Every structure is written in structure tokens, then in C-alpha cells.
């Protein structure tokens, strides 16, 4: 529940900032997602209006994904945003690597299209 917001943010960052030439998307997502999780643990560790736009974008994504992903895409997303690697996700779901990689990739493209469409609204 808690770190889930951070995971999603990490992923949205992954998607917005991906360099095709620098690496595979799966590993870039894994990187961004764990940086966000760790950031939020580090922050909560030293502790022990830009945010409203972000919180809303995270919430819009949760709904977009709930309402538009396949069951398979949702199963993958669940582990992706909790910082599991595509290899670990294959093991978890008893699916092969290629199949997970392609799913993460569909999550990316479908999310991309959603972001561009959300940024274009002028009713």
C-alpha cells in the first residue's frame, strides 16, 4: 500500500524519461522504481503545490490502469511497481521472460498514449 504510490511515480518517471539507446525499458523501469522506493524510505529515515499535481497524476494513472489493462497487464504492474525485476516477475507468475518483457512494454506504450492524450485536453 504505502510504497505503492512511490512505485507508480517511479514508473511514470521511467516512461517520461526513457532513452531507447541507453538500455532496455524493463531495466530502466526497475531502476526508477527502486530509486523512488528508496528515496521514500531514506526520507522517512532522516525524518525519524507541486505535490497536488503529482498526487493527482498518480491517482489518474491508477484509474487508467484499473480501467484499461488486461488481467495479465495488471498482474505484471502489481509486481513492477513493488520493485521486482522482469526476471523475478516471470518466476512469480510462472511465465516466460519474453512474455513479461512484452507486457511491460505494452504497459509503457499504452501509458505513453494516455499521457500524451491527457496533456492535450482543451475540452
UniProtKB/TrEMBL annotation:
<comment type="function">
    <text>Sigma factors are initiation factors that promote the attachment of RNA polymerase to specific initiation sites and are then released. Sigma-S contributes to the protection against external stress, thus playing a role in cellular fitness and survival.</text>
</comment>
<dbReference type="GO" id="GO:0016987">
    <property type="term" value="F:sigma factor activity"/>
</dbReference>
<dbReference type="GO" id="GO:0006352">
    <property type="term" value="P:DNA-templated transcription initiation"/>
</dbReference>
<keyword id="KW-0804">Transcription</keyword>
<feature type="domain" description="RNA polymerase sigma-70">
    <location>
        <begin position="2"/>
        <end position="15"/>
    </location>
</feature>
<keyword id="KW-0238">DNA-binding</keyword>
<dbReference type="GO" id="GO:0003677">
    <property type="term" value="F:DNA binding"/>
</dbReference>
<dbReference type="GO" id="GO:0006355">
    <property type="term" value="P:regulation of DNA-templated transcription"/>
</dbReference>
<comment type="similarity">
    <text>Belongs to the sigma-70 factor family.</text>
</comment>
<keyword id="KW-0731">Sigma factor</keyword>
<keyword id="KW-0805">Transcription regulation</keyword>
<protein>
    <recommendedName>
        <fullName>RNA polymerase sigma factor SigS</fullName>
    </recommendedName>
</protein>
